[PDB]
Amino acid sequence: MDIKINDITLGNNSPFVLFGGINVLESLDSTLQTCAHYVEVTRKLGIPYIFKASFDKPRSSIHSYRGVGLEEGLKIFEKVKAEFGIPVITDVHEPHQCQPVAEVCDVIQLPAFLARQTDLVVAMAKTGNVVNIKKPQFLSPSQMKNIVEKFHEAGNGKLILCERGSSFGYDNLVVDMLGFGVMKQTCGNLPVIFDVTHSLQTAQALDLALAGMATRLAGLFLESALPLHLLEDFLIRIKALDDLIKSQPIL
């Protein structure tokens, strides 16, 4: 199943879409700078692009910086949308945040550690917006339908599934390349995407991204952490593999 996001078609059998950007919003100026580089690079490559950022990092240390918060963050997003004419994605943590975020941000994201906060799921669903579901590391590819079931029960079917690795012993993540196919089969062929950045915690990034896309995915999710100047060389290679894979009929 495909999902229109303004002009972009996101589907497992459509050219891959890049979800990319910073980790958290810090300034209007820093955000515009990084997004211009993301846009300028993606536009020349002809890769549909969606800008990602967090307005709050609620898992941060007690005395560390957490973000600009919701109010100013949304304004930053309005300006990004205005200047580049692209869709944006951000994560939501509290039910009450869902509607005000949804009016600005085309894609709202459910954090992996929160997949089972029922109230948040319902408030995200009410919005009618496109949802990105981060698969928790402790969840098997086929249990992913349980969360998909919940959004359908809440009346929203415009969902993307996001792989970010599976828990492997202590303090380590493996990505089961077969998971992508299982999520596709059990969840009605909703768009699946690969968060390669988070899957890497604990050259490598490229191998992983490439392997993931070989299985035939809707999109690639990343933070930049990756350098730029390498973002272009990096994506050139992804585009080349994605083109090839997508040009071959399924089966």
Place this chain on the structure above:
Amino acid sequence: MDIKINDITLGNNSPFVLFGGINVLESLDSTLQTCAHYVEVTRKLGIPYIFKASFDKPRSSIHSYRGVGLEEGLKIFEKVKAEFGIPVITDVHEPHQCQPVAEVCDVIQLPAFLARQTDLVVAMAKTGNVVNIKKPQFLSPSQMKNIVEKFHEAGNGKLILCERGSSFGYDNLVVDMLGFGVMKQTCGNLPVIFDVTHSLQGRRAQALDLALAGMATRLAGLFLESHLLEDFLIRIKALDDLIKSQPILTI
């Protein structure tokens, strides 16, 4: 390090404390009848006991009953304390719930999926009450220290760690019996309790084996979410008496 909860001494060198009750609070009459059974068996064997329930928890399904809520829950708790003169324990999900819940409930529980949530940790710490931290399944015993550090900076030292199991491949949980010892060394020998029920996802034969294994490592308490109970508690008590009556190994 010992924690006085009213007249109960909870600590890894103290007779084990049973934590048990119901999943979600329905009514006063339903709560009293179930608590009564627990209180009868525990008193019959002289086992210190703490009643457990949720006033408001997210569930398996969207429209599953979350519980009577804060206001009616606290009244139910107050009567249970009045009735049986025992400590109670409940979970909190929102910073705002912490202060009024802490007025009634001797121990407050941090849900596993919210463990890294700084705002909630602060709110729970600021209460000054005994806090139970539920260990996420995708977390290693060595990184529980980080959650423990967060509580100390926020000014609360009165903490219980609660083992619930670790991810073991897909759709499985294993309890690493070495984990218990690692939490003691690395976190100042805080009270550790073993949540046997959620560790298990006949099955009573199995709950026993697991419970006995845990308690052989020498632990502050036992955590259930389940006459059949008596014969069970007889065996835990036997083992806990034997273990707690021997000095820890000599340096």
Place this chain on the structure above:
Amino acid sequence: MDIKINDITLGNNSPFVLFGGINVLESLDSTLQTCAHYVEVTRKLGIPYIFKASFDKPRSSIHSYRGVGLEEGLKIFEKVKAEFGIPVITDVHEPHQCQPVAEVCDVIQLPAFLARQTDLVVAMAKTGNVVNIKKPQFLSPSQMKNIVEKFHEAGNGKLILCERGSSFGYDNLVVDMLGFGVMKQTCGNLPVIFDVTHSLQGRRAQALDLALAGMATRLAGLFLELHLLEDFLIRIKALDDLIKSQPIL
């Protein structure tokens, strides 16, 4: 099901048996010294004891001591049996090793990784001796029935199942305490023992907590390679004694 090993009764509801000795044999002299130590300790605690050692060490680096080897090793075992009148256990890696080893050793052991190899299974089974089957670290407890089933097909049912941990990510082992029960329920309550030594990889304390957690499930025996051994055993016995006096539910 109980197994008579000479005068020792090994079974999931009998007093636990200690298995232990040295990693690998080097000389008659230091071997007799270690064995004497174990017999001294277990005797005064009243714990049955089977002495364990390898004669070969085949995964070692090429330039390293691999051990005394088979002809010499059995000679040391013969003299260990003569000196102390105890049973012994050792491991075999090649089908031809089996029979000569079985002449001397009461229990012969199938290394976990060789559990696959049917030839060795067959050769081990034809000796008639008591076999210790280590559980491969990637195998589920319930899959032990298949190997047990192989030994029954080869005509030997005097089998002890041995737990040594499971693979847990890279370079790590966890011991799943429910495994013991699953194994006891699926393999007809054959003796189950616990190799805590290899289940591991301050600390000597990790061994006790592990042994204690394991023995609390109710097991036939245990493996263990100023007085740390007796300090350990005193506690293990107290636990085993308590657990084995409870009726089975």
Place this chain on the structure above:
Amino acid sequence: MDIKINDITLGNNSPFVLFGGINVLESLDSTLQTCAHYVEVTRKLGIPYIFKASFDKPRSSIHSYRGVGLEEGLKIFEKVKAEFGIPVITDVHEPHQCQPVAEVCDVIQLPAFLARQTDLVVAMAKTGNVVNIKKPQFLSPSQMKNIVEKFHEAGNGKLILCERGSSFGYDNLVVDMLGFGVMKQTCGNLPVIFDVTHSLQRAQALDLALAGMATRLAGLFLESPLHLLEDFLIRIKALDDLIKSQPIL
């Protein structure tokens, strides 16, 4: 590092090589038919191809057919080599087997469970033959160098590393796509190949094969859906040709 297996060039930066054939050698005519189809498809696509089978692999049951054996096995290989002019690969389990096998076979294989038995590594090393080393499922990728060092000490540097998955909970395997990179960096960029058949435990095989070869590999290892092979190799070749044509970043 490039390995010349006869006229074939095998390396992480060469066009991928296909290791393919049957599980166990059962008969002469049957073997030649399967190999005929593999050769037919591969020559048709210009993929270098090496034939694979065992003559003695232990099986799930103790009495299931292990294979034709060493004597007849080597004769069947002689016959495949004569008829098709292609190289062959087989596995070996005993030190004494290494020599008779290496005289006929172009690549000898060390089965994963045996991968740390030094006697066998040394006997393999001493042949001077090309060696395929299966990674054991319970070993981490950065521990391969230890096996690689053992081979070097014994005087053989012409080694292939073969991925077949890692233990992931009970009775389940996962392929860590980062394992290939780690092996390249730590073992001197030796040829790495991917055994998807044993990695599984289909559309899956294809997906796994493609993910695998996306990371840039010397070859692909598989057993036999025997006619969808052409359609399958069409896709693998496509991806491999694309990847291989770009320089390493």
